[PDB]
Amino acid sequence: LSKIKLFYNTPFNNMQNTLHFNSNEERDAYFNSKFDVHEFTSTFNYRGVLRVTIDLVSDRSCFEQLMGVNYCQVQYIQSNRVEYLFVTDIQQLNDKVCELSLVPDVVMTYTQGNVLNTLNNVNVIRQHYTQTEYEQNLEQI
Amino acid sequence: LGLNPINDKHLLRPNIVTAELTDYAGNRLPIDLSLIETNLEFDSFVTMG
């Protein structure tokens, strides 16, 4: 019930440094166009933290050694909603079917675009300032 | 001070920059750069004769 990309050697691996795009499908446009060597289709369970099995029929010196993968896209169909997750570990099972553990990158999934600015009455702690607001909390800083 | 004036005004604070006047005779004046709103202007108050 869902198509899956499996991004290789990604920068996103601090569960707390993210990238930000003016709007959702501008990032789906981003991600949907950079790949190195693998995308597939399956389906998967949930409860984070969760697992997705996957396999590689074409091998000679592969088996596990899909290796550098650490981030992935899933889009459920039909639903066509997208959700990104970190791949935390790739425990292997046999000489071609390795099993992936996953955890949702909520920060990339939901926060995209001009959302968080709409939020009112939140106690903030630390942010970066607009030039106006800078001049205001300036004597402070 | 080799500070970029366009976006480093928040760096005029005493643990990054310090200003002191002296007459080289022990009369001194310490200055805390976090308190000058925009300009380090020195004026004086002299009485003579």
Binding site: T18, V106 | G2
Partner: protein, 87 residues
């Protein structure tokens, strides 16, 4: 003045983690204030429209401990943060 290097360590620190605001009850400053990255760290209370309550509990708390919002991928693997700046 402090050493050129140390001046950058500070420049960096600020450019990386923003500044300290003790603003309870306030609208977030703009998320794209900066040119390289924006820091953003905030306690409750908020919900985002139409999000699995489970996933919210993460966002709500992932942001309580701050999150760096980079603007360009290139900036994530070059020493560019020293030149973060407003507009």
């Amino acid at each position: 003045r402090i050493s050129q290097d140390e001046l950058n360590n500070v420049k960096k620190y600020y450019n990386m983690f923003g500044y300290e605001c003790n603003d309870y009850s306030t609208k977030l400053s703009d998320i794209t204030s900066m040119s390289i990255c924006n820091w953003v760290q905030f306690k409750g209370i908020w919900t985002l429209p139409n999000v699995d309550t489970g996933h919210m509990n993460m966002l709500r708390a992932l942001f309580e401990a701050g999150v760096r919002l980079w603007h360009k991928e290139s900036d994530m693997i070059n020493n560019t943060v020293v030149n973060n700046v407003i507009i």
